[PDB]
Each structure stands twice: as C-alpha cells, then as structure tokens.
Amino acid sequence: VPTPAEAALAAQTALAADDSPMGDAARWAMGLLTSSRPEDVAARFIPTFNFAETVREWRSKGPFTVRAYHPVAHKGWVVLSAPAGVRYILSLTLDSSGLIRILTLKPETVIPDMVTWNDVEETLHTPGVQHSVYAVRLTPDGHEVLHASAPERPMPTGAAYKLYLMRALVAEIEKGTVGWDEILTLTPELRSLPTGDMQDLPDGTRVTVRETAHKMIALSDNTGADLVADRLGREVVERSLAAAGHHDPSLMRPFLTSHEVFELGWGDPERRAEWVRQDEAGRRELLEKMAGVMTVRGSDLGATVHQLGIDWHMDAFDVVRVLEGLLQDSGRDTSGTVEEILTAYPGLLIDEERWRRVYFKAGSSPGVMMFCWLLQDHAGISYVLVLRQSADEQRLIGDGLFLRGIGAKIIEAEAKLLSS
Ligand SMILES: O=C(O)[C@H]1/C(=C/CO)O[C@@H]2CC(=O)N21
Ligand SMILES: O=C(O)[C@H]1/C(=C/CO)O[C@@H]2CC(=O)N21
Structure with a gap:
C-alpha cells in the first residue's frame, strides 16, 4: 500500500509520462503554476474562453508539490501541497480535441x-x-x-x-x-x-x-x-x-x-413566474412559445430553480x-x-x-x-x-x-x- 512519499512520487512520474490529451493539458497547467503570454493561453483553451490575474493569484499560493494525479478521460484532478501543509486541487475539464474548457484551483476536497x-x-x-x-x-x-x-x-x-x-x-x-x-x-x-x-x-x-x-x-x-x-x-x-x-x-x-431548463430557469423572471402558476397545459404552451435560439448564457446561471420543477x-x-x-x-x-x-x-x-x-x-x-x-x-x-x-x-x-x-x-x- 503506497506510503505518502511513494504515492506523491508515483503521481509525479505518471503526470510526466501521461501521453494523452489530459496529460498534455495537466502538464501545461502545472507549468503555469510553477514557472515564471496571451497567444499560448488562447491556443490551449476552447475558442470561446482576467485569466492573467487569475494565474497571478494562483501562483501566489505556491510553491506547489504534486501529491496525487487523477486523470479520467476528459476530466482530471491534480492534488497539490502548498507551504505549511495547505492543499489544493487543480481541476481540468477538456473538450473533444483536448482544449481546456474549465480550469480551477480550489481548496482541497477532503474525503476520508x-x-x-x-x-x-x-x-x-x-x-x-x-x-x-x-x-x-x-x-x-x-x-x-x-x-x-x-x-x-x-x-x-x-x-x-x-x-x-x-x-x-x-x-x-x-x-x-x-x-x-x-x-x-x-x-x-x-x-x-x-x-x-x-x-x-x-x-x-x-x-x-x-x-x-x-x-x-x-x-x-x-x-x-x-x-x-x-x-x-x-x-x-x-x-x-x-x-x-x-x-x-x-x-x-x-x-x-436542457435548453429549456437553462432558458426558463435563468431567463425572463415573468416567464418563470408563469411556469410556476401554470398547469400542464399552460406549461406546454409556455414552452412552445419559448422555442427559439437561447438568450441565456452560462454567466446568468446561479440562483436555484429546481424547487420550481425546472x-x-x-x-x-x-x-x-x-x-x-x-x-x-x-x-x-x-x-x-x-x-x-x-x-x-x-x-x-x-x-x-x-x-x-x-x-x-x-x-x-x-x-x-x-x-x-x-x-x-x-x-x-x-x-x-x-x-x-x-x-x-x-x-x-x-x-x-x-x-x-x-x-x-x-x-x-x-x-x-x-x-x-
Ligand atoms: O480517488 C479518489 O479518492 C477520488 C479523488 C479525490 C481527490 O483527492 O479524485 C478522484 C476523482 C475521484 O472521485 N477520485
Ligand atoms: O459528467 C461529469 O462527470 C460532470 C457532470 C455532468 C453533468 O452535467 O456533473 C458532475 C460535476 C462534474 O464535473 N461532473
């Protein structure tokens, strides 16, 4: 059963050797954190992807040591120790060609x-x-x-x-x-x-x-x-x-x-009050009327609407x-x-x-x-x-x-x- 030093070493070696879209992205993201250029960033992320300030703040938390590495298809997690036993996780989500869609560095999620x-x-x-x-x-x-x-x-x-x-x-x-x-x-x-x-x-x-x-x-x-x-x-x-x-x-x-959950849940508040008020017929009618191109963006999501049936x-x-x-x-x-x-x-x-x-x-x-x-x-x-x-x-x-x-x-x- 791997001891702490064994597990961190195996994680570090596996990250370096991981010849895959997740390996490529995880290694690149780790370099942002551990090294000292808007074009190279733009090329690593999805085309429709502040970040410089985001990276500066991430880097201020280091230096980082890799402690665990968890690639899972288009999802990945790297567990990092920073000074004074403080741990973080770097989370990656990739698109179908291995561009980064989501990259966060957050306080460690502890599961015993x-x-x-x-x-x-x-x-x-x-x-x-x-x-x-x-x-x-x-x-x-x-x-x-x-x-x-x-x-x-x-x-x-x-x-x-x-x-x-x-x-x-x-x-x-x-x-x-x-x-x-x-x-x-x-x-x-x-x-x-x-x-x-x-x-x-x-x-x-x-x-x-x-x-x-x-x-x-x-x-x-x-x-x-x-x-x-x-x-x-x-x-x-x-x-x-x-x-x-x-x-x-x-x-x-x-x-x-999903289009309907997004558009109703986070769009026009009156249209959302109409749903809540309506019976099955009125809701079917409301949805038919709502049909079209989305107006809601990922930035609009936040408030919970599941309690409304959405x-x-x-x-x-x-x-x-x-x-x-x-x-x-x-x-x-x-x-x-x-x-x-x-x-x-x-x-x-x-x-x-x-x-x-x-x-x-x-x-x-x-x-x-x-x-x-x-x-x-x-x-x-x-x-x-x-x-x-x-x-x-x-x-x-x-x-x-x-x-x-x-x-x-x-x-x-x-x-x-x-x-x-
Ligand atoms: O194997 C595990 O313990 C957990 C984990 C925990 C993060 O430190 O990361 C990977 C993804 C997952 O659910 N696994
Ligand atoms: O597919 C996954 O593993 C994704 C997901 C998809 C649900 O929309 O929801 C959970 C949160 C996350 O990152 N998981």
Missing part, C-alpha cells in the same frame, strides 16, 4: 477512506443540504439493499434524465423508427449550454444518431441530448418514463430539454430502474452500440480486473448534484449506487468533487461496503 456506511453518512451530511445514498445488489428476484438514506425522496438529478432519453432512443431503434447512422443536423435553435462540446460545432453540422448519443452520455453533452430529444419528440421521450421505471411521471411532464426529479429507486433497464437494453443489442456508449466514461479510474462493466452518469444544476454507477463483476453480479444532494444555495454543494469522491471511496471499499 470509508470503513462503514455510517462513515459515508457522517462525512456527507451538510446542514442545509438534503442528501440520499442508495446501494443495492441486483438479483433475479429483486434488489438486496446494502444501504439506504432517503431513497424514497424525489430529488432533482440534472443530466441523470439523459438515462431516460437513452432508453427512449433505444426503444425507437428497436422499433426501427430511428437508425444509429441517421443524420441529425445542428441548428441555431438546437444549440444548448455546456456540459458538452457539440454547441461548438457550426450551424448545419451533420452528425449521426450514434455519435450524438455517445456524446450525450459520455460527455453529458446537453446539445447532443437536445438533438436526440428533438428527433424523438417530447411525447415519445415522455411516453417512455412509465416503461423505463418512474414513481411519478407527472414530475417530468413536460419532460424539459430540473428532472426522481427517487433513488427510479435511478436503479433506468440503469437496470439500460443493462437489459444493452444485452439485447447484439451490435454492441448501446454498450459502447454506456461504458465509454465510467467517471472514475475503475479496477477492470474486478468490474467487467460500469455504467456511470452525473447530473448537476445550481443547488443539485448527483452521481450514479452500475458496476457488474465478471461473474455477472451487478451493484447500483445512487448519490444525490440538493440545496437552496449552490455554495453548500460546490463543484461535485465531494460527492464523486465519496462514490470513489465506496467503490474502492467495495469488498467492505458492496460485496461483503
């Missing part, structure tokens, strides 16, 4: 090693935050509950809704009303905000249903999700919540697009059901297309000798964080873990490394917590 489920509960609890943890083993005859806190509580789940969108899509593929190689087309009206990269494509860009669905899940691409929802139609997306496991489908009807609400059982349904859908798809999409991005570095397959999905919105995994071993034993937080203030939740890291520690301690 978990021995018991009570460790989990006591670590996670935050006054003013509602949380829920649900862990099950799936069996032919129902689910064995390993741990449960508030699974029956419906909570906002952000892009976890894209699990239902995926199931709706597979349902239509099986019916032959849509094809994996059918072409979807990006239009101004169909463009949404990040998470994702597809919004950065030119108007009129032609993309397959397959690659759109891949990015919708793997990159949580909001524009990719909105492209699929547009192609399927809202009625088809909705008329599948009942089939695909949902305790109260009325909570997601109308089943909002999010996607589900209970922990619903999340287990849709993941279990996806497992089944994947198994029926002899082409492996569904499986490849579901497994591309497991959200963590996974022990592949232990786990044959891992599905993952996150959701986040102001005041909302969630992570869920389905992990199946090589004997075919499946576990699902569902972690959720909601609050009236986004600062009580933070950037989601906490909740993800809790999952990470649970999964690390699987022989204690999951498979004991």
Whole structure:
C-alpha cells in the first residue's frame, strides 16, 4: 500500500509520462503554476474562453508539490501541497480535441477512506443540504439493499434524465423508427449550454444518431441530448418514463430539454413566474412559445430553480430502474452500440480486473448534484449506487468533487461496503 512519499512520487512520474490529451493539458497547467503570454493561453483553451490575474493569484499560493494525479478521460484532478501543509486541487475539464474548457484551483476536497456506511453518512451530511445514498445488489428476484438514506425522496438529478432519453432512443431503434447512422443536423435553435462540446460545432453540422448519443452520455453533452430529444419528440421521450421505471411521471411532464431548463430557469423572471402558476397545459404552451435560439448564457446561471420543477426529479429507486433497464437494453443489442456508449466514461479510474462493466452518469444544476454507477463483476453480479444532494444555495454543494469522491471511496471499499 503506497506510503505518502511513494504515492506523491508515483503521481509525479505518471503526470510526466501521461501521453494523452489530459496529460498534455495537466502538464501545461502545472507549468503555469510553477514557472515564471496571451497567444499560448488562447491556443490551449476552447475558442470561446482576467485569466492573467487569475494565474497571478494562483501562483501566489505556491510553491506547489504534486501529491496525487487523477486523470479520467476528459476530466482530471491534480492534488497539490502548498507551504505549511495547505492543499489544493487543480481541476481540468477538456473538450473533444483536448482544449481546456474549465480550469480551477480550489481548496482541497477532503474525503476520508470509508470503513462503514455510517462513515459515508457522517462525512456527507451538510446542514442545509438534503442528501440520499442508495446501494443495492441486483438479483433475479429483486434488489438486496446494502444501504439506504432517503431513497424514497424525489430529488432533482440534472443530466441523470439523459438515462431516460437513452432508453427512449433505444426503444425507437428497436422499433426501427430511428437508425444509429441517421443524420441529425445542428441548428441555431438546437444549440444548448455546456456540459458538452457539440454547441461548438457550426450551424448545419451533420452528425449521426450514434455519435450524438455517445456524446450525450459520455460527455453529458446537453446539445447532443437536445438533438436526440428533438428527433424523438417530447411525447415519445415522455411516453417512455412509465416503461423505463418512474414513481411519478407527472414530475417530468413536460419532460424539459436542457435548453429549456437553462432558458426558463435563468431567463425572463415573468416567464418563470408563469411556469410556476401554470398547469400542464399552460406549461406546454409556455414552452412552445419559448422555442427559439437561447438568450441565456452560462454567466446568468446561479440562483436555484429546481424547487420550481425546472430540473428532472426522481427517487433513488427510479435511478436503479433506468440503469437496470439500460443493462437489459444493452444485452439485447447484439451490435454492441448501446454498450459502447454506456461504458465509454465510467467517471472514475475503475479496477477492470474486478468490474467487467460500469455504467456511470452525473447530473448537476445550481443547488443539485448527483452521481450514479452500475458496476457488474465478471461473474455477472451487478451493484447500483445512487448519490444525490440538493440545496437552496449552490455554495453548500460546490463543484461535485465531494460527492464523486465519496462514490470513489465506496467503490474502492467495495469488498467492505458492496460485496461483503
Ligand atoms: O459528467 C461529469 O462527470 C460532470 C457532470 C455532468 C453533468 O452535467 O456533473 C458532475 C460535476 C462534474 O464535473 N461532473
Ligand atoms: O480517488 C479518489 O479518492 C477520488 C479523488 C479525490 C481527490 O483527492 O479524485 C478522484 C476523482 C475521484 O472521485 N477520485
């Protein structure tokens, strides 16, 4: 088991040797912090990306020593020690060609090693935050509950809704009303905000249903999700919540697009008061009227709106059901297309000798964080873990490394917590 000096050395060597988009970006960002030029910056970041002042302030906190390095596809984390035992984390999020979309340097997110489920509960609890943890083993005859806190509580789940969108899509593929190689087309009206990269494509860009669905899940691409929802139609997306496991489908009807959550949640306050006042008919009518090119920008987001219904609400059982349904859908798809999409991005570095397959999905919105995994071993034993937080203030939740890291520690301690 690596001692402190061993782990920091291994992290440092791995960062230097990491021949990948994350390795390239992580090494470059570390150089900004440890060395002594607007063109080289602009070339490292997304085209639509103050920063000089940001970097100056970062550098004032050093010198930094690399203590841990956690590359995970387009997401990365570097744990740094500064003078006097003070630790920070550098977080990277990349686009599809390895340009930096998000780069932060923040106080360290501390997650202790978990021995018991009570460790989990006591670590996670935050006054003013509602949380829920649900862990099950799936069996032919129902689910064995390993741990449960508030699974029956419906909570906002952000892009976890894209699990239902995926199931709706597979349902239509099986019916032959849509094809994996059918072409979807990006239009101004169909463009949404990040998470994702597809919004950065030119108007009129032609993309397959397959690659759109891949990015919708793997990159949580909001524009990719909105492209699929547009192609399927809202009625088809909705008329599948009942089939695909949902305790109260009325909570997601109308089943909002990401464009719609963004535009309604952070646009015109009167239009938002109209939603709150309206019944299902008036809300469908409001959304039809709102249809068009977004006016809301990422800079407008902040206040929480999930408490108004402007999010996607589900209970922990619903999340287990849709993941279990996806497992089944994947198994029926002899082409492996569904499986490849579901497994591309497991959200963590996974022990592949232990786990044959891992599905993952996150959701986040102001005041909302969630992570869920389905992990199946090589004997075919499946576990699902569902972690959720909601609050009236986004600062009580933070950037989601906490909740993800809790999952990470649970999964690390699987022989204690999951498979004991
Ligand atoms: O895909 C991920 O891992 C992203 C995400 C996407 C949800 O929009 O939300 C959580 C917060 C974060 O960085 N995670
Ligand atoms: O393996 C872990 O402990 C956690 C972590 C914690 C940050 O120090 O970073 C990686 C991403 C994640 O959830 N893992």
